[PDB]
Amino acid sequence: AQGLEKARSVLETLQQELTTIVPIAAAVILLCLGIAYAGRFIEKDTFVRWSIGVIIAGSAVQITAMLFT
Amino acid sequence: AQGLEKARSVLETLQQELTTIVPIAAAVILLCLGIAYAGRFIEKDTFVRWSIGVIIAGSAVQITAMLFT
Amino acid sequence: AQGLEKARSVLETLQQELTTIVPIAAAVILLCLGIAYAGRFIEKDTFVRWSIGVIIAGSAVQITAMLFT
Amino acid sequence: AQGLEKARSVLETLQQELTTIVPIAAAVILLCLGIAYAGRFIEKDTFVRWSIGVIIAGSAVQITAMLFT
Amino acid sequence: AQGLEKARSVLETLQQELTTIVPIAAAVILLCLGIAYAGRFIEKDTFVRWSIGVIIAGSAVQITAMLFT
Amino acid sequence: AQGLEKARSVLETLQQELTTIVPIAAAVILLCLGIAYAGRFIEKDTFVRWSIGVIIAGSAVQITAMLFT
Amino acid sequence: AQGLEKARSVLETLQQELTTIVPIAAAVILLCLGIAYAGRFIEKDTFVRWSIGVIIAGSAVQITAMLFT
Amino acid sequence: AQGLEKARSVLETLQQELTTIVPIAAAVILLCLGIAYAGRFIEKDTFVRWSIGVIIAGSAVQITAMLFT
Amino acid sequence: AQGLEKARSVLETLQQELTTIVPIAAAVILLCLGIAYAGRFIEKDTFVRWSIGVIIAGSAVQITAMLFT
Amino acid sequence: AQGLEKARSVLETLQQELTTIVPIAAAVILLCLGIAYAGRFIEKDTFVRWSIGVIIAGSAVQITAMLFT
Amino acid sequence: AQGLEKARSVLETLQQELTTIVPIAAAVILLCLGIAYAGRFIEKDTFVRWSIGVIIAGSAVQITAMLFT
Amino acid sequence: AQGLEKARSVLETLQQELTTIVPIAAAVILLCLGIAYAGRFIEKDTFVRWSIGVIIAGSAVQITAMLFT
Amino acid sequence: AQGLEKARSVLETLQQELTTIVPIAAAVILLCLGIAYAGRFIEKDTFVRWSIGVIIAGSAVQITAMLFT
Amino acid sequence: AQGLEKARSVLETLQQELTTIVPIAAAVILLCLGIAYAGRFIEKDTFVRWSIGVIIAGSAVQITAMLFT
Amino acid sequence: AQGLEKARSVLETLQQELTTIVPIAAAVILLCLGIAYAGRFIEKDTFVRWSIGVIIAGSAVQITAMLFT
Amino acid sequence: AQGLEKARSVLETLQQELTTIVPIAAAVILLCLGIAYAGRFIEKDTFVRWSIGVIIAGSAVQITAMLFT
Amino acid sequence: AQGLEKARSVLETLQQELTTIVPIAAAVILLCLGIAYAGRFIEKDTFVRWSIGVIIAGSAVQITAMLFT
Amino acid sequence: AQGLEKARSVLETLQQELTTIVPIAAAVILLCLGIAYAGRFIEKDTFVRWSIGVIIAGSAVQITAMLFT
Amino acid sequence: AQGLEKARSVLETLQQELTTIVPIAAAVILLCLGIAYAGRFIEKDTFVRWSIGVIIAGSAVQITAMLFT
């Protein structure tokens, strides 16, 4: 019931599937970035940027719950 | 009665349902943005923009009541 | 009497009902706009536009009385 | 007498009643336009158009007397 | 009896058949959109648009029951 | 029977044929994009875009089943 | 038969012809890039970019088969 | 006999004649499009559009037999 | 006879005449493009675009025969 | 006769006249570029660009005959 | 006659007038450059750049005749 | 005799007179277009359009004889 | 006589009058463009555009006679 | 008489008035540009641009007479 | 009279008022620049730039009268 | 006499009266257009359009005498 | 008398009244533009546009008398 | 009386009310700009832009009276 | 009354609430900037920029009252 309960369930399923997919994408990104940095194509702060992005992505639900009260 | 009370109640129900749905959408957006920033596709101000948008969306009713007096 | 007093009363009732409905619509619009801005779909001037629109709509009667003298 | 004095009086009464009705319609129009502009459905020049229309309608008798001499 | 019970049954049958047909059309649309995005003919927000449209279409009956009360 | 089962079968046949055709189009697009990138006409994000598009197109039926429930 | 078998054959012929043409285009691009680099008009990463692009274009069918399953 | 067999034969003859005529028109269109693109009057997607149109027109009978079952 | 054989012959004559005219137009286009590029009004990719367009227009009949089977 | 022989002759006359005009335009362009480069407004690659453009424009007919076979 | 003889004459007049004007502009540029170099605002290669530019601009017609044959 | 020989002669006379008139109109149009282009009111492709139109209008009889056989 | 000789004479008079008027319009346009360029409102290619337009407008009759043969 | 002599006289009057007005506009532009350059808001080539624009606008009549012959 | 004498007078008034205002702006700019230079935020050439800009702005009318003759 | 002398005199009187009225309407139109342009509601070419229209209307009799001979 | 003197007087009265009204509208427009520019919503050329529009509207009668002679 | 006196009074009231409202909007804009500049989101010229806009807005009536004479 | 008094009160409330919110945002910005500067990600002038921005934002009302008189 409630009209949009079904859409909420679908969105929850989509969020779970995207969360499952994300670590593979992050690992592939890091694999490419490490070799790019080894080849003098990018700089060392790229690893810090990647770490910040991955840490933020990991706790996306917690941050959203903290902000969207 | 009052003619348009039923429409107002329907709009209230719609607002409640959209408010219930919104946190999932915000979490999915943040999850995507984290990986996008990790992969050097966007910039660091994206997180600030997301935080501002989510904070405004969380207090939409209060802001509307403050402005539409 | 006066021929069109009844129509004026009906219009006043309609105006009151629409004024009652409007804050919910404004809150829903702001809720959608916040998430749209979080996801990089719109820009920050949208909030300024929304604020101006809501402020104008809130004092519609006063502005009408000021201009239509 | 004068044949059309009665019709002129009826027209004057109708004009007065319509003038009484108009401000409510203008207020309702502005209330709708403000929310429409808040939701990105119209542009900012709509308010200028509304102001010009209301100002012209307010002084309809004076403009008619100035032109129809 | 009830005059329009037969017409309502026909409409329900048509709705069920259209609901059955829709997923194939959605899959074809997504298949075309993926290749169009791969070929640099459209943008990444097309997937978000498609997801929103499909989610709305899937819960059409629930949304109609929530609004048309 | 069921009125629209024939149209559903036709749509399924069309979907299967389009799925058969798609890999050739994707291969041609990738072949052109590789030479375009070698010639300094596009950037490296084109390959990521192509990969995302092809992956989404490949699992169109699964995504449609996940969302259109 | 099967509706789109003829179109699939035409697309396969087009793909084979484009694959035949591509090596000449890649060779001309490399010939121009080498002289441009000799004249201090481009940088040394251009050769890496060209190699990556040509390698990806060469195995376009294999990559498409790996991703579009 | 069958009443409309003669009309069907006339339609088949017209279809064969138009099918014979079309390749010349396609060649002329491509000849004009190549020069127009060389002179910076159109874009490179025009060739993709032309190829899709020609492939669809060539296998029109097969597609019609696949859809009109 | 064949009904439309005369129209086909007329189209062939028109195609031959346009093919005869085209090289002059291509030469004029390239003559203008060279001077425009000399004066810093356009970029160096214009020559690649022109070459692609002229090569495609030259073999328009062959491409049409390859695609329109 | 031949239908478009007159148009071809007109195009050849136009091409010859433009070829006659071009050297003056190239000389004026080089005269302006030299002074602009003397005043530190442009860089030394401008002369290479101008030389390439003028050389290409000089043999436009030969290049067109080479590519449009 | 010849169609573009008049335009060619106008272009020649413009070229002669610009050639007459140029030495004054070159002298002013050199006068400014000398003082700028005296005050440590530019480097000594500026004079070499100016000399190359002025020498190239002086023989613009001869270089154009050498290249545009 | 021949019934319509007189009408054909009248049409030929009208065609000759219109052909005599046209060059003046074309010259006036080009005179206006040049000034409009100088004043930044139109674009450079207007000259190409004008040239194509004038060339087609010049050999209208030849094209009509080539097509209407 | 000749039916349309009078219209041709009128058109010639109109063309002569427009040719007389044009130099004033060109001078005014250049006067405005120079100040606009001095005020950073347009770019330096505006002068090239103006010169091309004025030169074309000057020899409009000659170009018309060359193309419309 | 001469049909358009009156319009030509009006255009000459407008040109004279605009020529009278222009020096004030140029002076105001230079006054603003000097302070803008002092405040590090623009660059030093702005004065060269202004000088070129003013010199061109000053001799607009002479340039128009030289080109429009 | 003379049509645009009023506009010229208004422009002269605006020029005089801006000339009156400018010294205050120049003084404020120099006051900020001195402290910015003392704090190691800018370099010593800023004062030369400021002096050149102020000197040019002070004699804007004289330079305009010298160039716009 | 002459049947239509009276009608011609009436038309001449009407033309004189309309010519007397026109300047006021043109001034009002320009006054409105100036404010509309100041308010960013229209573009700068509106002034050119107005000037062309007013100049044409001013010499309407002369143009009519030139064309209608 | 003169038939249309009354309409001319009415138009003169309307012109005077609109001229009286205009300065208030111009002041309001400038007040809004200043705040919009301070809020980074528009650019600095808006003030130049406003000044030009107001100056043109101020001398509308003079410009009309200069052009409509 | 005078027809448009009432509209002028209404416009004066609107101008006074907007002038009263403006300082709050300017203060809010400055408050947001200061924090945005502190967070490295905008540059230091924004304060100069804001000051220019506010100074222009404050003396809107005086500038309108100076230009619209 | 006075029409826009209500809007002014709403704007004052919004300004007070934004002023209340601002110190937290400034503190968070400084907290992030300190760590960024510690990790060699930004320079030491960032603190000066932050101090200037915060000081300007703190006295926004006073500065607005000083400039907007």
Ligand SMILES: CCCCCCCCCCCCCCCC(=O)OC[C@H](COP(=O)(O)OC[C@@H](O)CO)OC(=O)CCCCCCCCCCCCCCC
């Ligand atoms: C003086 C030396 C200074 C620089 C040091 C290096 C100089 C010479 C280096 C020789 C390298 C030659 C080739 C290796 C390239 C290299 O060293 O760059 C490392 C490569 C990506 O690096 P980059 O992003 O820097 O590529 C070049 C760009 O920088 C050009 O802007 O990472 C890999 O995974 C290697 C892939 C090999 C290429 C084949 C790929 C085919 C399969 C993948 C396609 C699937 C589609 C989806 C993918 C997400």
Ligand SMILES: CCCCCCCCCCCCCCCC(=O)OC[C@H](COP(=O)(O)OC[C@@H](O)CO)OC(=O)CCCCCCCCCCCCCCC
């Ligand atoms: C040879 C050494 C040269 C460099 C020295 C340092 C190298 C190694 C540094 C190790 C750092 C590892 C991780 C610490 C990061 C660090 O040191 O960088 C400081 C960080 C911002 O740093 P950056 O802007 O430099 O990030 C990278 C950019 O430079 C990319 O260009 O400031 C913080 O607030 C730290 C937050 C921790 C990350 C987790 C955040 C999750 C919750 C917050 C999300 C809420 C959303 C809204 C927020 C407003």
Ligand SMILES: CCCCCCCCCCCCCCCC(=O)OC[C@H](COP(=O)(O)OC[C@@H](O)CO)OC(=O)CCCCCCCCCCCCCCC
């Ligand atoms: C690389 C990253 C760059 C971009 C960042 C985001 C990338 C990935 C984002 C994933 C989002 C997936 C889904 C969330 C969508 C999202 O993120 O966009 C926010 C959404 C609408 O915003 P948009 O303007 O972006 O909508 C799509 C447009 O982009 C179309 O062009 O607001 C919502 O309330 C979410 C609702 C979810 C959809 C279900 C709704 C069904 C019930 C409502 C119908 C009732 C009828 C009356 C309504 C008034």
Ligand SMILES: CCCCCCCCCCCCCCCC(=O)OC[C@H](COP(=O)(O)OC[C@@H](O)CO)OC(=O)CCCCCCCCCCCCCCC
């Ligand atoms: C020198 C290195 C410089 C660049 C660093 C990275 C280089 C190599 C990266 C390899 C990545 C390969 C693939 C991962 C892509 C990646 O790393 O980019 C992160 C991706 C979004 O990336 P972008 O917005 O940059 O996409 C490409 C655009 O930039 C094109 O302009 O976020 C994800 O969620 C990844 C999903 C994987 C793809 C499968 C999705 C299928 C199911 C979802 C569909 C449901 C519909 C609704 C959705 C809301």
Ligand SMILES: CCCCCCCCCCCCCCCC(=O)OC[C@H](COP(=O)(O)OC[C@@H](O)CO)OC(=O)CCCCCCCCCCCCCCC
């Ligand atoms: C420098 C690179 C910049 C661009 C990157 C790509 C360059 C080269 C691309 C090569 C593509 C060659 C051909 C593949 C085309 C391609 O890659 O574009 C993808 C195609 C449509 O894409 P577009 O939106 O670009 O179509 C043309 C538009 O651009 C027109 O403006 O989607 C498909 O399903 C492909 C079908 C192949 C054509 C045969 C279809 C016939 C049977 C179907 C008919 C049934 C009727 C009902 C249908 C629902």
Ligand SMILES: CCCCCCCCCCCCCCCC(=O)OC[C@H](COP(=O)(O)OC[C@@H](O)CO)OC(=O)CCCCCCCCCCCCCCC
């Ligand atoms: C100084 C160096 C800086 C830049 C590096 C390169 C400079 C010199 C490059 C020389 C290249 C010369 C020619 C090769 C072109 C090249 O290198 O660009 C790669 C080409 C597409 O390139 P672009 O999209 O950049 O084309 C020009 C556009 O950029 C215009 O803006 O991809 C191909 O498949 C090549 C095909 C050859 C052309 C013949 C095709 C005819 C048959 C196909 C038609 C069928 C219709 C349907 C199609 C789907």
Ligand SMILES: CCCCCCCCCCCCCCCC(=O)OC[C@H](COP(=O)(O)OC[C@@H](O)CO)OC(=O)CCCCCCCCCCCCCCC
């Ligand atoms: C501190 C030193 C650092 C920089 C060194 C130079 C600084 C001072 C230079 C003083 C120069 C002052 C004036 C000379 C200008 C100069 O030195 O720049 C050289 C000039 C064009 O140069 P630019 O393209 O650099 O012009 C400025 C541009 O850079 C603005 O973006 O070439 C000429 O032909 C000179 C014409 C003089 C202007 C009169 C022309 C009037 C008749 C022609 C119009 C016909 C229309 C159609 C034309 C195709």
Ligand SMILES: CCCCCCCCCCCCCCCC(=O)OC[C@H](COP(=O)(O)OC[C@@H](O)CO)OC(=O)CCCCCCCCCCCCCCC
């Ligand atoms: C202090 C030194 C610093 C710089 C070092 C070099 C300075 C002096 C160099 C002298 C070079 C003079 C001439 C050689 C040119 C040179 O060095 O540049 C190399 C040239 C392209 O170079 P760029 O891209 O740098 O061209 C100029 C651009 O940089 C403008 O931004 O590559 C070639 O293939 C050469 C062709 C010769 C030109 C004739 C071509 C005509 C027929 C081909 C056209 C067919 C159309 C289709 C094509 C795909």
Ligand SMILES: CCCCCCCCCCCCCCCC(=O)OC[C@H](COP(=O)(O)OC[C@@H](O)CO)OC(=O)CCCCCCCCCCCCCCC
């Ligand atoms: C710091 C320097 C930066 C810029 C470098 C150059 C600055 C100075 C250049 C001086 C050039 C002055 C005049 C030469 C113009 C020039 O150099 O630009 C090259 C010209 C066209 O160039 P554009 O497309 O750039 O024209 C202006 C456009 O850019 C406007 O957007 O090509 C020609 O054929 C020249 C013809 C001369 C004009 C007479 C033509 C009359 C007969 C033809 C009409 C027949 C109708 C049918 C036509 C198909």
Ligand SMILES: CCCCCCCCCCCCCCCC(=O)OC[C@H](COP(=O)(O)OC[C@@H](O)CO)OC(=O)CCCCCCCCCCCCCCC
């Ligand atoms: C971010 C900023 C971007 C936009 C800048 C401006 C924003 C704020 C502007 C405030 C304007 C408030 C009101 C002034 C309006 C304004 O500024 O627009 C200028 C006005 C007409 O302008 P528009 O064509 O833009 O009218 C509105 C159009 O947008 C309709 O779509 O011209 C006037 O004459 C003003 C008259 C005032 C209204 C009273 C007239 C009553 C008597 C006349 C009736 C006689 C009948 C016959 C007439 C021929």
Ligand SMILES: CCCCCCCCCCCCCCCC(=O)OC[C@H](COP(=O)(O)OC[C@@H](O)CO)OC(=O)CCCCCCCCCCCCCCC
């Ligand atoms: C910080 C510096 C950066 C930018 C540099 C400039 C900043 C300051 C400039 C001060 C300008 C103030 C006023 C001078 C204006 C100025 O400098 O712009 C130059 C003006 C036209 O310039 P624009 O096309 O740029 O006009 C503004 C447009 O850019 C708006 O988008 O040329 C003139 O002829 C001057 C006329 C003065 C206005 C009065 C005209 C009234 C009678 C004529 C009407 C007859 C109708 C028919 C006409 C054909």
Ligand SMILES: CCCCCCCCCCCCCCCC(=O)OC[C@H](COP(=O)(O)OC[C@@H](O)CO)OC(=O)CCCCCCCCCCCCCCC
């Ligand atoms: C390594 C460091 C490099 C960057 C330095 C800063 C990094 C970390 C900064 C942390 C900031 C976190 C959040 C504070 C945001 C911040 O610091 O940015 C300052 C904020 C807007 O600034 P921006 O233009 O940067 O906004 C985001 C844009 O950058 C997106 O492109 O100004 C404010 O007024 C703050 C309001 C707080 C947000 C809550 C508002 C909710 C109620 C008000 C809504 C009423 C509607 C009508 C309004 C007119």
Ligand SMILES: CCCCCCCCCCCCCCCC(=O)OC[C@H](COP(=O)(O)OC[C@@H](O)CO)OC(=O)CCCCCCCCCCCCCCC
């Ligand atoms: C190891 C040392 C190396 C660096 C030396 C200095 C280090 C420490 C310096 C401490 C300075 C702390 C504060 C003084 C600032 C300072 O020293 O910088 C000097 C300041 C401008 O400096 P900057 O342009 O460098 O500002 C920061 C920028 O560099 C950010 O990129 O000039 C002033 O007028 C100072 C005003 C004080 C701030 C209050 C202003 C509020 C009212 C005015 C607003 C009205 C709006 C319109 C205005 C036109």
